[PDB]
Amino acid sequence: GSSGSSGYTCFRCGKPGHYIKNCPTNGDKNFESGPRIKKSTGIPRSFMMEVKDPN
C-alpha cells in the first residue's frame, strides 16, 4: 500500500471511494481483480524513482 497520493483505498479489490468493510465485491462470487489484467510492462520503477544526481 502507498501513502500519499490518496488517503486510503479498499484493500479488498483495490478501488477507492469505499473501504474493504464497505466493499461491494463482498456480496459477489465472481468479480474482477485489482485495477486491470496488466500488472507491469517491463520496468523496475518509473515514477517510484525519486533519485536525483547533480552530475
Are 10 and 16 contacting, i.e. CB atoms less than 8 angstroms apart? Answer: yes
Stretch that binds Zn ion, among 1-9, 16-24, 35-43, 44-52 (CB under 5 A): 16-24
Q: Figure out which of the listed residues 1, 3, 7, 13 binds Zn ion, where binding follows CB under 5 A.
A: 13
CA-based angle 8:28:24, to the nearest 5? 30
CA distance 25 to 42: 30
Q: Is 9 in the site for Zn ion (CB under 5 A)?
A: no
Minimum distance of Zn ion from residue 13's CB (angstroms): 3
Instruction: Point out which residues bind Zn ion (CB under 5 A).
Output: 10, 12-13, 15, 23
